[PDB]
Design an enzyme around this catalytic site. Structure first.
Site, PDB file in Angstrom:
ATOM      1  N   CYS A 172      44.719  38.316  33.248  1.00  0.00           N
ATOM      2  CA  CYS A 172      44.419  37.160  34.086  1.00  0.00           C
ATOM      3  C   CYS A 172      44.610  35.846  33.327  1.00  0.00           C
ATOM      4  O   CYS A 172      45.020  34.835  33.904  1.00  0.00           O
ATOM      5  CB  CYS A 172      42.985  37.269  34.596  1.00  0.00           C
TER       6      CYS A 172
ATOM      7  N   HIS B 299      34.319  36.005  37.608  1.00  0.00           N
ATOM      8  CA  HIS B 299      35.502  35.325  38.131  1.00  0.00           C
ATOM      9  C   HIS B 299      35.623  33.934  37.530  1.00  0.00           C
ATOM     10  O   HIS B 299      34.630  33.347  37.088  1.00  0.00           O
ATOM     11  CB  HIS B 299      35.450  35.212  39.663  1.00  0.00           C
TER      12      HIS B 299
ATOM     13  N   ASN C 210      44.728  31.214  41.449  1.00  0.00           N
ATOM     14  CA  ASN C 210      44.419  32.364  40.606  1.00  0.00           C
ATOM     15  C   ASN C 210      45.441  33.462  40.845  1.00  0.00           C
ATOM     16  O   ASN C 210      46.453  33.245  41.515  1.00  0.00           O
ATOM     17  CB  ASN C 210      43.023  32.911  40.923  1.00  0.00           C
TER      18      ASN C 210
END
Lengths: 76, 182, 76
Positions: free
Chosen positions: B14, B119, B134
């Site tokens: 991520c 998150h 994202n």
């Protein structure tokens, strides 16, 4: 004794464990506080990954030890 | 939406998308995540070597996980603070009371990342508005100026660690073309 | 054309190169400048690794463009 579990986010979890405590049990303790699934809990200590079937003494882990929890916490 | 660094990915890594869309455009790299993370390890190692209190110093701090490449592919603030640092940008905490007290209009800022542990929100100024994106968000949440003020407050109340980037951030073509939108 | 080079310490150096200059030749320039050997040097241009046997032309590196000098990928 108490240990310091560094979670990938900038948090240090201070939990009380046992020398003969299995790594898998340690995960359950973390799950009780953070709620992170033990299965996805990649516990690593000093670069060496902690195996679920091993104990804290197996990796020479004592009090105030710096543990590191690895996983996709960000999600996205 | 002509030339915009819009990369897509899923399944860990991520941070590779967070940095890829940090300074509005791409410039970083996946392998760099392990390099910038090891920068802290590099300094901490030599530091803990001299200031070694116990045996764990030259053990756990000699091989710090994630710093020397992550297992899943996720890095915490260790790569965020360093990423901006090597470019000449500073990271300010807008959630911690000891710093939040500065009370600086977030609309005047360039970009800030919100962290809730489970998150992270990648928010950056685009054109004349604010965009949140994202790897789990294909739709850029258009944040209005008046909404941003409330958004920042809501984040603080929720417990979102707001990392504001101070300085001159290199804008891309997406900034210029977004100026024609509302 | 004078591009740039972003080190892992935050330092940037005005690297001068030619349109048909190869990444390998650029690494040499960096070797003299910094000292780090080409095999240790890694160059990235916007989420893309630059191969030693590739010219800057193909890469599209325009005038005055930064570059990422990666050199830490060891883990354990």
């Amino acid at each position: 004794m108490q240990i310091f579990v560094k979670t990938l986010t900038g948090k240090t979890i201070t939990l009380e464990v046992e020398p003969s405590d299995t790594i898998e049990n340690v995960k359950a303790k973390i799950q009780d506080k953070e709620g992170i699934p033990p299965d996805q809990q990649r516990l690593i200590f000093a670069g060496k990954q902690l195996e679920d079937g091993r104990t804290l003494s197996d990796y020479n882990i004592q009090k105030e030890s710096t543990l590191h929890l690895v996983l996709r916490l960000r999600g996205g | 939406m002509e030339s915009i660094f819009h990369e897509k990915q899923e399944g860990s890594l991520c941070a590779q998308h967070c940095l890829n869309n940090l300074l509005q455009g791409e410039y970083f790299s996946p392998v760099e995540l392990s390099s910038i993370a090891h920068q802290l390890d590099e300094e901490e190692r030599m530091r803990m070597a001299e200031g070694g209190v116990t045996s764990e110093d030259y053990r756990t701090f000699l091989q710090q996980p994630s710093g020397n490449m992550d297992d899943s592919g996720f890095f915490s603030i260790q790569v965020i603070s360093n990423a901006l640092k090597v470019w000449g940008l500073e990271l300010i905490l807008f959630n911690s009371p000891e710093y939040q007290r500065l009370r600086i209009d977030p609309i005047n800022e360039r970009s800030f990342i919100c962290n809730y542990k489970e998150h992270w929100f990648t928010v950056r100024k685009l054109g004349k508005q604010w965009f949140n994106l994202n790897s789990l968000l294909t739709g850029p949440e258009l944040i209005s100026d008046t909404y941003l003020a409330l958004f920042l407050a809501q984040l603080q109340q929720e417990g979102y660690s707001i990392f504001v980037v101070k300085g001159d951030l290199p804008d891309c073509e997406a900034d210029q073309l977004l100026q024609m939108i509302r």
